[PDB]
DNA sequence: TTTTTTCGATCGTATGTTGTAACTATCTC
DNA sequence: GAGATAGTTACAACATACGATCG
């Protein structure tokens, strides 16, 4: 199996085609761009007919198998596209894919698009069989650190002069949503044919459409960026995310920090990290968080979390978000007069 | 037979549209250069002009003279589109046609070539209400759009739409109109209507609009009705007082200033309106908590409190934190005691008086 | 506006024009039939924004000119409910329609006729006349091959072609192509158009086996058919229909003449024994012999051997049972002729007596 | 045989409406000038009379004498509207008509012209109970309705309506009626009905009404039933005014003066009288609260309890807060 | 315990018994059916704790007494799988039964028969036998008036009353009443019982064209009907029923006579524009005249006039057209007699030819 | 090199499958 | 030329999946 990235597909396609292609990832923009490039190359090579299906146990595989076995009246080199379910392949779906693999031939070109497969999902007889003659594309949304590089590359590709301040503004406003970034770049290019994208021009034609996850909120809390944490929490509230997931995500890290701080007085930090099986990249952030606050904090935080959970469940209240913001400020280096904690 | 200002006064050219400069400029440049995307999506708040801009774009695309950024407005096609009688203009109301069998009959008619116009425009409004299978059919159509067919989509909440439709469409987000723009538009409309007005009345109407020009026009109509053909400041003030709902913040301000008379007046006004007392206490507690958060960090407020952001920030700047904590504790105790009070209004009055004057004695160890 | 007619005369046109109309139309007015009295005639019009049906009835009673609209379902039910032999007198009063039948009275709401959509007038390009039987045969021969629902919309309809004195119908679905031809009898300019499935279905429904000639007019984008007192107007689907001539084999070297009934019954027996879905049927032809075997993975190979009039080189080919069964059923005769070039090549089937109807099918790849 | 007072005494003209002067003035000015909107929303508490005002507006629009702010009330259209038989007054029960199918049917049957009247008035009651799909379907129709179609909406909880629906309508919020207006209306109704009454009974009924006039009428019916055709102070006190007696004030004064024997004697007297204990505690708490309010603001005490005013003021001057 | 079974004989009884059985077992043994052998017959029984159905099949070959339980789904699948005309050999061998289909031996798990909730002893309080035609007529004429889902649980069934030599079926739902009486030729004690909807509908379903009489026996808590080779047992509501004769109007002053077909057609024609949700009509009855008026929420109106035999004072009455139409359809006669008293009183409907059955409809007050 | 959220009761919208009743067509009397 | 039996279409009832609000 040839592993590649969306930035390295044009050269491979120009060099030659392949029996099948697999597109796995999370970002819709890169996936659709790869799909479009592959389809354009196939059409240039004579693939005229294109058919699309969504993988689903409700959907019938008989039609797909008949299409694979059948031959068009006045066409050749058909293209078949399969959209995997968001949850992932099931045992029945795995068996159906294994059956389909045999039907594959030279003219038929299979393109699979779907979410990234887990370790168990990746382990499959059909996947292993096709690995010998398959090209896989890794499509992972770049992190905030990697985002400005991608934005600069996109601006250069479209022949746009983008300033550092404009790059930062675009990264902040449309973090985690590459499709919005691309559409904003297109709109800006249309607005000014000259292509001189100054900071005011971008500021006057940009809206807030960032997308975040609870893990990002917890990481921001650990870092201590109060503004970033508040922005992430506001975005999560706006998009309609249940606070239960946020609470459970924060609970694990809070308890881990409490335990480490309690045990840090007698054991080296590295030994504790090794015992608790923490990620290597997270060790620095964990150490910074531990050194940033003392046992006085991380104890009132537990009280806040318990009170918030009780209010959510027993009372079925609606002030959960205010308590979450207060806890976020408390985790950051803030006074937190402690009347709200109700100690 | 006077007509509603919102219905009577509608944009007819990109020049008439107030604000939304970026979207109009982008559309004009695209039309001039010939870059026409196969699907456009319009998003924004209420009364920002999504449907008006969509109709103007439809006029521009099918104008007899040519594909011009600014439609002439005099040719037969422009008039028919304005009247909603154009042969190739189809205005699908997804709200009342969420069924699959209703959308399929139109996606099938997409096949036929336009009778008169260059393009067979399909204007779908309130697209977010369509069903899942309808979304699938629309996705198929957008995947294979004939070169002579265009799609215009308007939705207040684009989040509901599947990501595939968003990817296969060019999005345009319309910003909420500023206070000055709404005031200027109201002044122009009233001047063209030969109706007397006062600057303070216009300012109050613009403030009450909250970024929706349609709300501004509705309030202007109400003021004209109340003022007997005149937009007088007295009538606008009376209307706003009758429909005012910021009584919680006013009560908080009065409590901070320690003015009993204003507190009593606000309580009487709330009693006349019938606002729930426990809800009022909860709102006051939330306001105090948010003011404390603002004092801790200015980034506490976002777009949710944009209506009353200035007052909240001023209170945060002025009030010392300790007074805010004391008021919060007093109101919390009052909320705890409210159920046992003989009357909820009586409990609220007692709590407010206690916060004003009676300082709780902090328990000793 | 008023008139007086009989239920017997008015029953048929109501059913004819109320057929396609139904469900919930996009515009309310589209759900109402347009009734117009003028020139001693009553015209009933029903439209669906893409097709129009008009019926005309002669009047032998005093009347007044006018036009109005009336809901189709309510009016049809009222007319059908009256006793047989009764006479219906209709009048327009204010913005309402009053219907009298003996001592029974009905009142209905109506809408202005001005707002009723009117199909833009167009000039016909090719106008001619055709007998009913020929068009019935063409439609029957070139109907089953159409694609009920396909991504390529232009394949949904069927191709009507005129050339000299020949009228040809072509249908396809991407796997099988059926072509039929008839002699028009009159010289006409060459021209090809595409008719959607709804249009051809309505045209077939309109014919009733009568001897009345059919007047067919074809314009730039619309097709009009006059049959007796009925006018049917339809729009033409825009597209580029694939060329049927290229698909046809240039010179099939191998030919096989067999009995239509024998092949049909053999295929039916195989299908009954092969009721399981998936896979196709493999037929091996040898000199004066044919062997048909189901291609099931594990099911018993209940192969059937039949005798045919063949003497060429033997070969094995796989086919889909449904396509061959449909071709055999559609071509109802006693003998058939099948021509082919090689294994990977489309096989053509026709009648040994006449070559008017041809069906070309791509073999299943294996 | 007698019909309920609430149904019988329904305002049939704008002159019979008690209070709500701002809304009535606005509607009268709109009708007189001719600036008639196609979407009116009425909000407020219960019993304020939103439905009555909607019916009056419907009468005003569809009157054979023309569009007038003062409907005649004698023409057949007015009579039919009053009797709930007019053909061009479509009343929708949104509480039962919640599913979007009914809304779709209504919007499909909205194009036809009215039978007799000059408008087809759709009065939807309890509109807040409609599902979101019904609101979305009604949006566009409210935006550009036919000229001969008017929409009237009424609800108690306008906070749960979609923001767009609120933007698409003219809002009128009715406020709760004060004590004096309720008392005057009750006095007028009783005078018309030829039933004896006493001023304190009317005062107690008005105080117990708490804004809602329908509550006042129901309590008046209860008082009439209890008093056997008369509205007496004792009859009203039996059911409602079991509280508000000088015993509570005497107990408060005794407690302030630390007179244990007097308090015990008052308790024994109340027990002999058969006084509810929770009501007694409620009255004592209320008296203490009103004394506190007097200490805060001298104008806290109104005429309602003027009989004891002086005494109350004394307790305000001596007792520290 | 050798049993020889023919697929032809076994097919229909198996489907009949499996009918009531549903997918949801609710109990380990409820899905299973009880198969027993007695003397020279085999009984297959199935129940869901509310209704029981048992079918008997004659046996000729020698056998010995026995009783067991077999799952319904597995037995049905086995019967379906075997080719038509096959002979099934069933034997008891330990805890698992043996099925010998040709050379195929199958072992089927068997649960003890002592745990099957089957009634052992039956006591009949009142038993009789009637032809299927009479019972079918009574059920057909009285079923449509039963309530479906009402708070008054005693109104959710049909009242069967035996009085002297008369059998009476009564159905009511709070708005309409249907009473039917028929002689039986046998003297029975005065006894009334209530049968729920499920029992009545199952009895009607199992009942077929009159071939043999059916015997019905009613005990303290249950009713058992044996017809042909099937026995169906159900339980009773036991909630007491209102007296029908009280509901019937007393001394109806106004009497009207009319033709069944004419009134049915008039009501059907008037219902076209009647309200869809309510279906309300107004009848103005005057001397030898009946005027039917229907109104619509869309302001549409329909009026019809009919000639009848009436001589009383003019009256106006509102009604639900659906109930009247149902009563007329069920009556299925030529002349219909309507008895009424005032405009706010229930109206009775009967046949002039005979008074075997009567109906009562309560008018709608506006 | 990877991490999955409270629960019970009630209301509303849209699609797919099965069974029964009503209406139509064909063959034999 | 008409009636009876068998087949096709339409309507009503039941089952499954997804989304939202308040306690
Ligand atoms: N940008 C704008 N400029 C001028 N008028 C506007 C604008 N946006 C909205 N309006 C006013 O609002 C009324 C209705 O707009 P509407 O179709 O509701 O827009 P949307 O679809 O964004 O809600 C119009 O009559 C128009 O006068
Ligand atoms: N402003 C008013 N003037 C006189 N009577 C009123 C008024 N408001 C309400 N009522 C009385 O209260 C009763 C109920 O009013 P209702 O129509 O239910 O108002 P709402 O719709 O606000 O509940 C009416 O029968 C009427 O007699
Ligand atoms: F017409 Al709108 F939001 F009110 F699009
Ligand atoms: F009828 Al209401 F509040 F309007 F009870
Ligand atoms: Mg709009
Ligand atoms: Mg009301
Ligand atoms: Zn123009
Ligand atoms: Zn009048």
Coil, helix or strand for A153?
helix
Q: How far apart are CA D193 and CA D189, in angstroms?
A: 6
Q: D179 and D206 in contact (C-beta within 8 Å)?
A: yes
Q: B22 and A205 in contact (C-beta within 8 Å)?
A: yes
Q: E237 and E153 in contact (C-beta within 8 Å)?
A: yes
Resolution to 1 decimal, in Å?
2.9
Asked whether residue D282 is marked as a ligand-binding residue, the answer is no
Q: Examine domains E1-123 and E248-364 and report if their fold is the same.
A: yes
In the β-sheet with C87-93, what is the strand arrangement from edge to edge? C2-6, C87-93, C96-101, C104-109, E301-306, E289-295, E280-286, E315-320
Token digits of residue D117: 């009247």
- Please state which CATH number belongs to domain E1-123: 3.10.150.10
Strand-pair category, D39-43 with D149-155: parallel
Distances (CA, A) of A245 to A214, A315, D212: 8, 18, 45
Q: Answer whether E touches D (≥3 Cβ pairs < 8 Å).
A: yes
Helix runs in chain E, H state only: 7-18, 72-81, 132-142, 197-206, 244-247, 260-270, 321-331
Q: How far apart are CA B325 and CA E45, in angstroms?
A: 77
Coil, helix or strand for A276?
helix
Token digits of residue B49: 């002009």
Q: How far apart are CA D310 and CA D308, in angstroms?
A: 6
Neighbouring C-beta atoms of residue E136, cutoff 10 Å: 17
Q: How far apart are CA D236 and CA C233, in angstroms?
A: 80
- Name the residue among C316, C351, C338 with its Cα closest to residue C253: C338
- Name the residue among D214, D207, D176 with its Cα closest to residue D7: D214
**Three-state secondary structure along C241-297?**
CCCHHHHCCCCCCEEEEEEHHHHHHHHHHHHHHCCCCCCCEEEEEECCEEEEEECCC
Distance of CA E365 to the CA centre of its chain: 32
Query: Chains B, D: CB contacts under 8 A, how many?
Result: 100
The answer to whether C145 faces chain A, any CB pair under 8 Å, is no
Token digits of residue B312: 């909240």
Q: How far apart are CA B104 and CA A163, in angstroms?
A: 47
Token digits of residue C60: 């032998």
Measure in Å the smallest separation between the Cα of C234 and chain B Cα atoms: 11
**Three-state secondary structure along chain D?**
CCCCHHHHCCCCCHHHCCCCHHHHHHHHHHHHHCCCCCEEEEECCCCCCHHHHHHHHHHHHCCCCCCCCCCCCCCHHHHHHHHCCCCCEEEEECCCCCCHHHHHHHHHCCCCCCCCCCCEEEEEECHHHCCHHHHHHHHHHHHCCCCCEEEEEEECCHHHCCHHHHHCCEEEECCCCCHHHHHHHHHHHHHHHCCCECHHHHHHHHHHHCCCHHHHHHHHHHHHHHHCCCECHHHHHHHCCCCCCHHHHHHHHHHHCCCHHHHHHHHHHHHHHCCCHHHHHHHHHHHHHHHHHHHHCCCCCCHHHHHHHHHHHHHHHHCCC
Cβ of A58 less than 7 A from strand G: no
Distance of CA A240 to the CA centre of its chain: 18
**Three-state secondary structure along C182-247?**
EEEEEEEEEEEEEECHHHHHHHHHHCCCCCCCEEEEECCCEEEEEECCEEEEEECCCCCCCCHHHH
Q: How far apart are CA B103 and CA B157, in angstroms?
A: 20
**Three-state secondary structure along chain B?**
CCCCHHHHCCCCCCCCCCCCHHHHHHHHHHHHHCCCCCEEEEEECCCCCHHHHHHHHHHHHCCCCCCCCCCCCCCHHHHHHHHCCCCCCEEEECCCCCCHHHHHHHHHHCCCCCCCCCCEEEEEECHHHCCHHHHHHHHHHHHCCCCCEEEEEEECCHHHCCHHHHHCCEEEEECCCCHHHHHHHHHHHHHHHCCCECHHHHHHHHHHHCCCHHHHHHHHHHHHHHHCCCECHHHHHHHHHHHCCCHHHHHHHHHHHCCHHHHHHHHHHHHHHCCCHHHHHHHHHHHHHHHHHHHHCHHHCCCCCHHHHHHHHHHHHHCCHHHHHHHHHHHHHHHHHHHHCCCHHHHHHHHHHHHHCCCCCCCCC
Cβ of D317 less than 7 A from strand G: no
Neighbouring C-beta atoms of residue D147, cutoff 10 Å: 10
Give me the architecture of the E248-364 domain, per CATH. Answer: Roll (3.10)
Which nucleotide has the least CA–C1' distance to A242?
F5
Q: List the C209 CA – F27 C1' distance (angstroms).
A: 22
Three-point CA angle D117, D119, D123, nearest 5°:
110
Strand-pair category, D170-173 with D149-155: unpaired
- Name the residue among D270, D265, D275, D271 with its Cα closest to residue D243: D275
Residues of A whose CB is below 8 A from B175: 207
Residues of C whose CB is below 8 A from A62: 277-278
Contact D109 E298 (CB under 8 A): yes
The CA B123 to ligand 3 mean position distance, Å, reads: 14
Token digits of residue A192: 């000014």
Ligand 2 near D49 CB (within 6 A): yes
Q: How far apart are CA C73 and CA C82, in angstroms?
A: 15
Q: How far apart are CA E90 and CA D25, in angstroms?
A: 93
Token digits of residue D10: 């329904």
Q: List the C85 CA – G2 C1' distance (angstroms).
A: 22
Parse chain E into domains and list their residue ranges.
1-123, 124-247, 248-364
- CATH 3.10.150.10 assigned to domain C124-247? The reply is yes
Q: How far apart are CA E316 and CA E84, in angstroms?
A: 66
Ligand 2 near D45 CB (within 6 A): no
Residues sharing a CB contact under 8 Å with residue D27, sequence separation 6 or more, in sequence order: B225, D14, D53, D57, D60, D69
- Roughly how many angstroms between the first and final C-alpha of chain D, as a whole number? 56
The CA B141 to ligand 7 mean position distance, Å, reads: 28
E338 sits in which H/E element? strand E335-340
- Name the residue among E290, E300, E285 with its Cα closest to residue E262: E290
Rg of chain C taking only CA atoms, in angstroms: 26
Which nucleotide has the least CA–C1' distance to D101?
F13
Q: How far apart are CA E244 and CA E348, in angstroms?
A: 12
Coil, helix or strand for A264?
coil
Q: List the B297 CA – F10 C1' distance (angstroms).
A: 42
Residues of B whose CB is below 8 A from D44: 274
A11 sits in which H/E element? helix A9-15
Q: How far apart are CA D211 and CA D46, in angstroms?
A: 8
Q: E259 and E313 in contact (C-beta within 8 Å)?
A: no
Interface residues 151-180 of D with strand G (CB < 7 Å): 160
Residues sharing a CB contact under 8 Å with residue B155, sequence separation 6 or more, in sequence order: B41, B42, B43, B50, B126, B127, B128, B161
Coil, helix or strand for E278?
coil
Q: How far apart are CA D30 and CA B227, in angstroms?
A: 10
The residues facing A25 across adjacent strands are A115, A139
Which nucleotides in chain G lie less than 7 Å from some protein C-beta?
A: 22-23
Ligand 1 near B20 CB (within 6 A): yes
Q: How far apart are CA A228 and CA A331, in angstroms?
A: 13
Residues of C whose CB is below 8 A from E304: 103-105
- Name the residue among A79, A135, A74 with its Cα closest to residue A107: A79
Residues sharing a CB contact under 8 Å with residue C221, sequence separation 6 or more, in sequence order: B113, B115, C122, C235, C236, C238
Domains recognised in chain A with CATH numbers: 1-142 (3.40.50.300), 143-213 (1.10.8.60), 214-311 (1.20.272.10)
DSSP A8: G
Which nucleotides in chain F lie less than 7 Å from some protein C-beta?
A: 1-6, 11-16
Q: C264 and C329 in contact (C-beta within 8 Å)?
A: yes
Residues sharing a CB contact under 8 Å with residue E236, sequence separation 6 or more, in sequence order: E193, E194, E195, E196, E221, E222, E223
Residues sharing a CB contact under 8 Å with residue A326, sequence separation 6 or more, in sequence order: A304, A336, A340, B289, B293
- Name the residue among D22, D66, D76 with its Cα closest to residue D48: D22
Protein residue closest via CA to atom 7 of ligand 2: D49
Helix D50-61, helix D21-33: angle, nearest 10: 10
Distances (CA, A) of C179 to A230, B154, C334: 70, 46, 20
Task: Give the torsion sign (CA, C247, C248, C251, C256).
Answer: positive
- Name the residue among E307, B111, D119, E124 with its Cα closest to residue C149: B111
Burial class (CB in 10 A: 0-12, 13-18, 19+), A83: middle
Q: List the A123 CA – F5 C1' distance (angstroms).
A: 28
């Amino acid at each position: 199996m040839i592993r590649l990235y969306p930035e390295q597909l044009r050269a491979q396609l120009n060099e030659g085609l392949r029996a099948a292609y697999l597109l796995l990832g999370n970002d819709p923009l890169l996936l659709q761009e790869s799909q479009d490039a592959v389809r354009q190359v196939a059409a240039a090579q004579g693939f005229e007919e294109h058919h699309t299906f969504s993988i689903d146990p409700n959907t019938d595989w008989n039609a797909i198998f008949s299409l694979c076995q059948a031959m068009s009246l006045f066409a050749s080199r058909q293209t078949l596209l399969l959209l995997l379910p968001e949850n992932g392949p099931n045992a029945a779906i795995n068996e159906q894919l294994l059956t389909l693999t045999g039907l594959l031939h030279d003219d038929l070109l299979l393109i699979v698009r779907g979410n990234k497969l887990s370790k168990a999902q990746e382990n499959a007889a059909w996947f292993t069989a096709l690995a010998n003659r398959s090209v896989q594309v890794t499509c992972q949304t770049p992190e905030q650190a990697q985002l400005p590089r991608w934005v600069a590359a996109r601006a250069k590709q479209l022949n746009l002069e983008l300033d550092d301040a404009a790059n930062q503004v675009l990264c902040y406003c449309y973090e985690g949503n590459l499709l919005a970034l691309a559409q904003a770049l297109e709109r800006l290019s249309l607005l000014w044919p000259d292509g001189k994208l100054t900071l005011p021009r971008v500021e006057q034609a940009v809206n807030d459409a960032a997308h975040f996850t609870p893990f990002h909120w917890v990481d921001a809390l650990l870092m201590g960026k109060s503004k970033r944490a508040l922005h992430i929490l506001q975005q999560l509230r706006l998009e309609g995310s249940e606070p239960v997931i946020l609470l459970r995500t924060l609970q694990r890290e809070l308890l881990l920090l409490v335990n480490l701080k309690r045990q840090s007085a007698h054991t080296p930090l590295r030994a504790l990290f090794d015992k608790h099986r923490v990620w290597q990249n997270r060790r620095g952030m964990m150490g910074e968080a531990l050194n940033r606050l003392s046992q006085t904090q991380l104890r009132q935080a537990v009280q806040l979390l318990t009170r918030t959970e009780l209010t959510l469940k027993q009372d079925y209240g609606q002030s959960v978000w205010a308590e979450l913001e207060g806890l976020s400020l408390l985790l950051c280096h803030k006074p937190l007069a402690d009347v709200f904690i109700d100690g | 037979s006077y007509q509603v200002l919102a219905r009577k006064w509608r944009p007819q050219t990109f020049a008439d549209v107030v604000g939304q400069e970026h979207v109009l400029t982008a559309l004009a440049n695209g039309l001039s250069l010939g870059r026409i995307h196969h699907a456009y999506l319009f998003s924004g708040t209420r009364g920002v002009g999504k449907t008006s801009i969509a109709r103007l774009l439809a006029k521009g695309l099918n104008c007899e003279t040519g594909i011009t950024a600014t439609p002439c407005g005099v040719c037969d096609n422009c008039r028919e589109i304005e009247q909603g009688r154009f042969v190739d203009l189809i205005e699908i109301d997804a709200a009342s046609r969420t069924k699959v069998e209703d959308t399929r009959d139109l996606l099938d008619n997409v096949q036929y070539a336009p009778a008169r116009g260059r393009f067979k425009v399909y204007l779908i409004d309130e697209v977010h209400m369509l069903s899942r299978h309808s979304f699938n059919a629309l996705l198929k159509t957008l995947e294979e759009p004939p070169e002579h067919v265009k799609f215009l989509l308007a939705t207040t909440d684009p989040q509901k739409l599947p990501v595939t439709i968003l990817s296969r469409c060019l999005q345009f987000h319309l910003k909420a109109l500023d206070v000055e723009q709404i005031r200027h538009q109201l002044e122009h409309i009233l001047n063209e209507e030969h109706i007397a007005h006062e600057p303070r009345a216009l300012q109050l109407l613009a403030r009450a609009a909250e970024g929706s020009l349609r709300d501004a026009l509705s309030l202007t109509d109400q003021a004209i009705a109340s003022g007997d053909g005149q937009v007088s400041t007295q009538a606008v003030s009376a209307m706003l007082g009758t429909l005012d709902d910021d009584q919680a913040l006013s009560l908080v301000e009065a409590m901070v200033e320690a003015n009993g008379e204003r507190v009593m007046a606000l309580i009487n006004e709330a009693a006349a309106r019938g606002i729930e007392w426990e809800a009022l206490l909860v709102e006051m507690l939330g306001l105090l908590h948010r003011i404390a958060m603002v004092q801790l960090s200015p980034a506490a407020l976002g777009n949710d409190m944009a209506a009353i952001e200035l007052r909240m920030r001023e209170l945060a700047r002025t009030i010392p934190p300790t007074d805010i904590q004391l008021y919060y504790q007093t109101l919390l105790i009052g909320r705890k005691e409210l159920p046992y009070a003989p009357d909820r209004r009586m409990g609220v009055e007692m709590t407010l008086l206690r916060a004003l004057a009676f300082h709780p004695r902090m328990p000793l160890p | 506006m008023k008139f007086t007619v009989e239920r017997e005369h008015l029953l048929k046109p109501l059913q004819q024009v109320s057929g396609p109309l139904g469900g919930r139309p996009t515009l309310p007015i589209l759900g109402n039939l347009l009734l117009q009295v003028a020139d001693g005639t009553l015209s009933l019009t029903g439209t669906d924004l893409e097709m129009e049906m008009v019926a005309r009835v002669a009047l032998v009673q005093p009347h007044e000119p006018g036009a109005t609209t009336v809901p189709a379902r309510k009016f049809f039910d009222i007319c059908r409910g009256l006793p047989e032999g009764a006479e219906i007198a209709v009048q327009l009063e204010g913005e309402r329609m009053l219907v009298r039948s003996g001592r029974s009275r009905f009142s209905l709401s109506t809408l202005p006729a001005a707002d009723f959509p009117n199909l833009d007038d167009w000039q016909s390009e090719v106008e001619f006349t055709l007998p009913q039987a020929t068009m019935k045969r063409l439609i029957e021969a070139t109907q089953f091959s159409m694609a009920h629902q396909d991504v390529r919309y232009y394949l949904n309809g069927m191709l009507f072609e005129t050339e000299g004195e020949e009228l040809r119908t072509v249908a396809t679905d991407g796997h099988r192509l059926a072509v039929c031809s008839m002699p028009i009898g009159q010289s006409l300019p060459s021209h090809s158009v595409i008719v959607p499935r709804k249009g051809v279905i309505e045209l077939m429904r309109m014919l009733d086996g009568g001897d009345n000639p059919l007047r067919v007019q074809i314009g730039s984008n619309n097709i009009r058919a006059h049959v007796g007192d009925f006018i049917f107007t339809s729009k033409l689907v825009d597209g580029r229909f694939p060329d049927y001539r290229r698909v046809l084999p240039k010179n099939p070297d191998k030919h096989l003449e067999a009995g239509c009934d024998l092949l049909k019954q053999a295929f039916a027996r195989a299908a009954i024994l092969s009721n399981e879905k998936f896979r196709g049927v493999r037929l091996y032809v040898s000199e004066n012999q044919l062997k048909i075997t189901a291609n099931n993975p594990e099911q018993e190979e209940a192969e059937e051997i039949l005798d045919v009039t063949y003497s060429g080189a033997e070969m094995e080919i796989g086919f889909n049972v449904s396509y061959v069964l449909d071709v055999l059923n559609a071509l109802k005769c006693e003998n058939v002729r099948m021509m082919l070039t090689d294994s990977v090549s489309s096989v053509q089937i026709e009648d040994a007596a006449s070559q008017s109807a041809a069906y070309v099918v791509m073999p299943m790849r294996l």
